[PDB]
Design a protein around this ligand. Structure first.
Ligand code: CDL
Ligand code: CDL
Ligand code: CDL
Ligand code: U10
Ligand code: PC1
Ligand code: 3PE
Ligand code: 3PE
Ligand code: HEM
Ligand code: HEM
Lengths: 47, 440, 51, 74, 98, 56, 379
């Protein structure tokens, strides 16, 4: 609602560097992707 | 159910205090889950320039091992019971919350009693974590938002411990030695500056007994920060290879208690947040959002209210292309002065509803509720009930907002932090001149 | 037009009336000062010495 | 505003001929005179009446003035 | 009847001589500027060619032969719904502004 | 500090700034004209047609 | 590497303003007057400079200087009468330009319309001072009357009038300042005309039909440039006929008597191009009311974009409104004739009705009628 989610997403932009084994931890999806765009709330994913 | 009844029918955050000074608190409502955490009152704010980054290092080393739980055994306890251990350390706070099932709340408390009091700080582990700290800092270099916010903190609170980053300088990361970490854990993890907060189905008496049976042997019953200063300046990291240019503008905000927080949070709520992947676009009541969607001059912008104890940063951060920074600054400043001079009732009502929804929706789940408890017991000194929050929102009106924005925004030297193709960004003189309106 | 008046515009006016009215006061003082309107300066203490 | 950002148009075919093979005065009188007569017919009844009433007003004023300047029995 | 005077004014207006059906002679304000934009492709193309014909004729100071003068009873109002919708949206926007 | 109260009272809003400019100009004109006229009168004392007109 | 027409920074504006400017395809001759004004201004600049070549703006020698121009200087009479009749023709084209703007709905262009109103004001002031310069009987007496009209302003009336006069009456100072003002003002008109063109170019032009011609634009160079040249040739024809066959046709002979501030001429009629306001000035019995009506007669052009209500931009398709507009033109002609005539029984009442109806058409009749056809055309 008042909350802009958390990850404010820029297109034509790069990601965050992940050059750590710990950083990597978790990236590997365990559950299927689910897209969720919304009015007043930014679009994100969940895997 | 008339809303106000629901706020009145919220379980109270029961709080007690041990002899050592541990502030134990719980919000037992219904759930079979819980989040139990110990919110330290440490962070990069309480660190000298030699010790900068020690808090981050301690946070990393906390979960590795303890004397009672050597190394992976600690992890073996967290995963085998289904618990999720996590930590977070900002500039003025540090916490280690272990989300778990309400049935096994005892063990978790014992586990927490291990992590915060009896750490390991193994030297080989210290080097292994030093390398990880270095590579993770190189990672955070890519994070444009974090980098810009650290730039803002450096340029605003220059010459003060607030300027120090959480991770610390890369030189320190290599120069920290086990003696420094032991001193930090023996000087900033003292019992008085501790908040043991638990949410979910956690009976308060059981929590108190567990704390008295696990956290008793702690420090008995000075470094207490220095009032930092605001210095209107700017850091411009012109780098024309980044596709977008992140800019953050802020002014000295209120203190942690500083009831002026409630009106300002409404005022910022009027500005709102916009990005490219939103819905309505050219329909939002926020004039900045509507204009941005009408011209696509914004990629993603939001209003932040980072608020420390003695001071705080209140402003907006926007991400856009190279040829739209000036239009941004113009519209952002113009809306700020519009709220400053003529705020009117309708958008004030919209901001009141927006803030109500923010506070209400944030406080769901054991982790956010426990975080609220731990942070409130440290900053405000009490858990401000949602009923009190509603009462403090209710009397905010157009005149109150028009006066608080006048006292915080009008004719105030700002702090600017730009990164990327920020050449279009106006110099400090034009930005400062934006904060006064000759038409007023 | 009908686009004017209504709720929002009247408190907008109430907000901007002090500023606009005292800008008009600025204009009145500037006009009498620049044109040296003897009539008005007859009733100010210092500046009677001009005439 | 220059040529290119003006409009969107489709399926419109425009022919033309150079000024060097078409007579610059193609049946000038033969088609011009009916054209001018039609244009005059279209607008005379809506252009002339105010001018003729102006003419009447002007002439009337001229005599009325000079009669006022004439003598009078006494 | 009133339709008599309506038809008389339609014939006296003259835009029927050039082939224009009423809506082609609209003064393009902002609301109209949106109204053309919202039109479907076929109607928009027909309107633009029709206006091209009128501009050509006025440059030549000529009119269509009597046959291809758009009839009063055949003047289709292809823009009235879209323009009315734009006006209603503008009124709602102004009311919310109030 | 005096200047802080001065700024808060009459320098924040640009309307107050303009009003202060107007009234300050109005008073400063009298002050400067009197001062300069007195200075010129003093340095050329006994020479202009103001020390001598009463003598005729 | 690139066409100099669209490469040279100075050539950019000229090419985008006169060579490759997209203009409506169906532009009638009524738009040619836009050029006819500007070209005419240059003659007024060109001739007016040469009059300034041999001219002593002094009460005792101004008339002698003008006679020496028209009698002794080589072809000085040509320049003098070209200048005077060019000013009259300039006002002819100005009136036709305003009429075209009123008809084909060009006042929707706002900024150009207001700038044109300012142009009109400046041009009339310039012509007034110019007629003052020769220092004939009509020159001096008309100047006295028109500047005395400013006394109607409350409070500051007399001081303003004495300020404009430069003294106590129209004399040495008045003529001397009027000459310099007449020198400067046309350059202000030129800069303002450049601003006029700049504002116009952003909205293209209004074709006679009134519908947008964005999809039928044509290059400017091979087209109207030649048509504008033809219009300028016709304008030169009219001007040369006026100069060479009856120089003083549009001008009162009484001006040729040297200005004597002791004898009021039998008539104090101003130039032909001002009577339309002057008559209005005569109509209102109140002096201040007369001045306000006089200024409002010209100022009413500013209100025109506001008063328009017909959903059609142009007057091409509004018959009843066309009858109203031609009634307005007839009213303007009647006002000019009335201003020419003295203030007697038959003319006073005619002037009253002419002024009232001239205002009534613009304020009431035209918008009320514009409602009528909108209701008539099912919208
Ligand atoms: C009366 C006092 C002035 C006043 O109330 O101005 C209000 C208003 C400006 O609006 P504002 O909200 O006070 O300022 C921010 C605006 O966004 C308008 O400014 P901006 O944000 O678009 O651009 C910032 C900056 C950009 O600079 C300018 O716009 C002009 C700077 C000129 C500097 C001098 C060199 C050039 C000559 O604006 C200014 O410096 C002020 C502009 C208004 C005055 C311009 C004329 C000054 C003549 C001396 O003035 C005008 O609109 C112009 C007319 C009135 C002032 C001139 C007479
Ligand atoms: C006072 C200030 C100065 C005012 C004059 C200068 C400004 C306006 C300049 C207008 C201009 O350059 O061209 C206007 C206007 C533009 O149309 P246009 O080039 O004649 O083409 C015919 C129209 O499309 C219209 O065509 P239409 O349907 O009437 O039939 C074809 C044609 C044939 O009709 C006639 O020729 C009329 C019958 C009598 C001859 O029409 C005309 O020629 C009409 C013009 C009058 C002859 O041209 C003229 O008025 C021609 C100059 C006058 C006649 C020749 C004198 C030697
Ligand atoms: C026989 C009596 C004369 C003809 C009948 C006139 C009449 O009652 O209605 C005019 C009658 C109906 O008006 P219209 O044809 O719909 O007018 C089309 C354009 O608005 C106005 O005409 P346009 O722009 O299509 O074509 C230019 C036209 C008209 O040119 C002008 O009206 C401007 C130049 C003439 C001096 C300005 C005062 C008139 O030029 C001429 O007709 C003759 C040459 C005039 C001097 C050079 C130009 O048109 C004509 O007879 C020809 C044009 C008007 C001539 C006056
Ligand atoms: C269809 O539109 C148009 C035309 O003709 C209908 C035109 O002729 C022109 C071109 C007009 C002119 C060149 C003359 C008028 C312009 C001015 C008076 C502006 C000042 C510039 C000058 C070169 C003239 C004065 C020069 C010197 C004193 C324009 C722009 C136009 O828009
Ligand atoms: C011949 C050519 C050369 C002419 C002289 C050139 C050299 C002198 C130029 C003028 C001096 C510098 C500018 C002085 C004005 C100024 O400070 O402008 C910026 C200032 C702004 O300076 P500021 O931004 O430092 O202060 C205003 C901001 N607040 C309100 C937050 C403090 O402009 C204004 O203040 C505009 C409003 C007030 C001034 C205008 C009205 C005053 C009354 C006039 C008389 C009565 C009518
Ligand atoms: C001549 C007037 C003085 C010109 C030189 C001084 C000057 O330019 O001062 C700055 C003044 C205000 O402009 P600025 O500081 O950019 O602030 C605009 C609103 N944010 O700039 C102005 O143009 C204001 C001039 C007075 C009104
Ligand atoms: C004598 C004055 C008029 C001279 C020209 C003759 C005239 O007015 O002809 C009619 C002409 C018609 O113009 P048009 O737009 O074709 O009309 C469509 C009607 N359905 O009318 C016009 O073109 C109207 C032109 C109006 C502006 C110039 C004339 C008035 C100047 C007043 C000063
Ligand atoms: C805006 C264009 C101009 C107009 C409408 C205009 C109008 C007039 C008029 C009507 C006269 C009176 C002529 C007479 O009664 O014989 C005149 C005189 C004069 N004008 Fe202009 N003028 C213009 C431009 C200029 C310019 C630019 C100059 C100077 C370079 C100038 C210099 C003079 C001079 C010296 C006289 C006095 C000689 C004379 O009477 O002709 N004029 N002007
Ligand atoms: C100094 C005298 C003036 C000059 C040199 C001048 C110049 C021009 C020129 C060259 C054009 C383009 C040609 C045209 O459309 O006719 C034009 C258009 C226009 N002018 Fe003027 N003008 C003058 C006075 C005025 C006046 C008095 C007005 C009315 C207040 C005015 C309003 C307009 C308008 C509305 C247009 C747009 C006409 C259209 O494109 O449909 N101008 N002007």
């Amino acid at each position: 609602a008042a909350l802009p989610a958390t990850s404010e997403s820029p297109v034509l932009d790069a990601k965050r560097s992940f050059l750590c084994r710990e950083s990597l931890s978790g990236q590997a999806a365990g559950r299927p992707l689910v897209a969720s765009v919304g009015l007043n709330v930014p679009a994100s994913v969940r895997y | 159910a008339t809303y106000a009844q629901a706020l009145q029918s919220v379980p109270e955050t029961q709080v007690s205090q041990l002899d050592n000074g541990l502030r134990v608190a719980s919000e037992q409502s219904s759930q079979p889950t819980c989040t139990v955490g110990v919110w330290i009152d440490a962070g990069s704010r309480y660190e000298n320039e030699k010790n900068n980054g020690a808090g981050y290092f301690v946070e990393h080393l906390a979960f590795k091992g303890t004397k009672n739980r050597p190394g992976s055994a600690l992890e073996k306890e967290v995963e085998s019971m289904g618990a999720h251990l996590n930590a977070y350390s900002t500039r003025e706070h540090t916490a280690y919350y272990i989300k778990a099932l309400s049935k096994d709340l005892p063990k978790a408390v014992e586990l927490l009693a291990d992590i915060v009091q009896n750490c390991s700080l193994e030297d080989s582990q210290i080097e292994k974590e030093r390398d990880v700290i270095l590579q993770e800092l190189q990672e955070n270099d890519s994070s444009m938002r974090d980098v810009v916010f650290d730039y803002l903190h450096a340029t605003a609170f220059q010459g003060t411990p607030l300027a120090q980053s959480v991770e610390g300088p890369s030189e320190n990361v290599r120069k920290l030695s086990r003696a420094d970490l032991t001193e930090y854990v023996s000087q900033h993890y003292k019992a008085p500056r501790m908040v043991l907060a638990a949410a979910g189905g956690v009976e308060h008496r059981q929590l108190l007994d567990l704390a008295q049976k696990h956290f008793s042997s702690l420090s008995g019953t000075v470094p207490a920060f220095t009032p930092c200063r605001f210095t209107g300046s700017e850091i411009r990291h012109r780098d024309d290879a980044l596709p977008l240019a992140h800019v953050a503008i802020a002014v000295e905000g209120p203190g942690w208690a500083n009831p002026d927080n409630v009106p300002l949070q409404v005022a910022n709520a009027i500005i709102g947040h916009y990005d490219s992947t939103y819905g309505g676009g050219t329909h939002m009541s926020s004039t900045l959002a509507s204009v941005a969607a009408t011209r696509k001059l914004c990629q993603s912008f939001q209003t932040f209210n980072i608020c420390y104890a003695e001071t705080g940063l209140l402003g907006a951060h926007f991400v856009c292309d190279n040829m739209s920074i000036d239009d941004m600054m113009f519209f952002l400043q113009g809306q700020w002065m519009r709220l400053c001079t003529s705020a009117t009732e309708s958008e004030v009502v919209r901001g009141k509803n927006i803030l109500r929804n923010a506070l209400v929706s944030h406080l769901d789940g054991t982790t956010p509720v426990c975080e609220d408890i731990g942070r409130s017991l440290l900053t405000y000194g009490r858990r401000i009930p949602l009923a009190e929050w509603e009462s403090r929102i209710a009397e905010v009106d157009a005149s109150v907002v028009r006066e608080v924005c006048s006292k915080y925004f009008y004719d105030q030297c700002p702090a600017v932090a730009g990164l990327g193709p920020i050449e279009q960004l106006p110099d400090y003189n034009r930005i400062r001149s934006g904060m006064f309106w000759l038409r007023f | 037009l009908s686009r004017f008046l209504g709720p929002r515009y009247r408190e907008l006016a109430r907000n901007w009336i002090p500023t606009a009215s005292m800008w008009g006061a600025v204009g009145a003082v500037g006009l009498v000062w620049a044109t040296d309107w003897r009539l008005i300066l007859d009733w100010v203490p210092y500046i009677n010495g001009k005439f | 505003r220059e040529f290119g950002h003006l409009t969107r148009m489709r399926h419109v075919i425009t022919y033309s001929l150079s000024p060097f093979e078409q007579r610059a005065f193609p049946h000038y009188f033969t088609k011009g005179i009916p054209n001018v007569l039609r244009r005059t017919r279209a607008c005379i009844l809506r252009v002339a009446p105010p001018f003729v009433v102006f003419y009447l007003v002007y002439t009337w004023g001229t005599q009325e003035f000079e009669k006022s300047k004439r003598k009078n029995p006494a | 009847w009133l339709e008599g005077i309506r038809k008389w004014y339609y014939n006296a207006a003259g835009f029927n001589k050039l082939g224009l059906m009423r809506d082609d002679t609209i003064y393009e304000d902002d609301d109209v500027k949106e109204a053309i934009r919202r039109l479907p492709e076929n109607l928009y193309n027909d309107r633009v060619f029709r206006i091209k014909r009128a501009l050509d004729l006025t440059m030549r100071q000529q009119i269509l032969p009597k046959e291809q003068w758009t009839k009063y009873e055949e003047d289709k109002f292809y823009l009235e719904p879209y323009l009315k919708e734009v006006i209603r949206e503008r009124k709602e926007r102004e009311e919310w502004a109030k | 500090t005096l200047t802080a109260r001065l700024y808060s009272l009459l320098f924040r809003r640009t309307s107050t700034f303009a009003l202060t400019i107007a009234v300050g100009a109005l008073f400063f004109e009298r002050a400067f004209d009197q001062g300069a006229d007195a200075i010129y009168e003093h340095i050329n004392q006994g020479k202009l047609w103001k020390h001598i007109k009463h003598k005729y | 590497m690139t066409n100099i027409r669209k490469s040279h920074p100075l050539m950019k504006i000229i090419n985008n303003a006169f060579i490759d400017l997209p203009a409506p395809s169906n532009i009638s001759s009524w738009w040619n007057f836009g050029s006819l004004l500007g070209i005419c201004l240059i003659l007024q600049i060109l001739t007016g400079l040469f009059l300034a070549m041999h001219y002593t703006s002094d009460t005792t020698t101004a008339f002698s200087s003008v006679t020496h121009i028209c009698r002794d200087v080589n072809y000085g009479w040509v320049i003098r009468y070209l200048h005077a009749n060019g000013a009259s023709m300039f006002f002819i084209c100005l009136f036709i330009h305003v009429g075209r703007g009123l008809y084909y709905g060009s006042y929707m262009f706002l900024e150009t319309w207001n700038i044109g109103v300012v142009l009109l004001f400046t041009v009339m002031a310039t012509a007034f001072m110019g007629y003052v310069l020769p220092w004939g009987q009509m020159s001096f007496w008309g100047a006295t009357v028109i500047t005395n009209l400013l006394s109607a302003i409350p409070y500051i009336g007399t001081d303003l009038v004495e300020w404009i006069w430069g003294g106590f009456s129209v004399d040495k100072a008045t003529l001397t300042r009027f000459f310099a003002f007449h020198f400067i003002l046309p350059f202000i008109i030129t800069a303002l005309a450049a601003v006029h063109l700049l504002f116009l170019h952003e909205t293209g032009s209004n074709n006679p039909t009134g519908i947008s011609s964005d999809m039928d634009k044509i290059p400017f160079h091979p087209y109207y440039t030649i048509k504008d040249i033809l219009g300028a040739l016709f304008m030169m024809l009219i001007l040369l006929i006026l100069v060479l066959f009856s120089p003083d046709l549009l001008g009162d002979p009484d001006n040729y008597t040297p200005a004597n501030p002791l004898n009021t001429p039998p008539h104090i009629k101003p130039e032909w191009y001002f009577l339309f306001a002057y008559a209005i000035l005569r109509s209102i019995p109140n002096k201040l009311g007369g001045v306000l009506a006089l200024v409002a007669s010209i100022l009413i052009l500013i209100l025109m974009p506001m008063l328009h209500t017909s959903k059609q931009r142009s007057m091409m398709f509004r018959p009843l409104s066309q009858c109203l507009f031609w009634m307005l033109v007839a009213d303007l002609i009647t006002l000019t004739w009335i201003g020419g005539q003295p203030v007697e029984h038959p003319f006073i009442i005619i002037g009253q009705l002419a002024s009232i109806l001239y205002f009534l058409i613009i304020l009431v009749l035209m918008p009320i009628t514009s409602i009528i056809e909108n209701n008539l055309l099912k919208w």
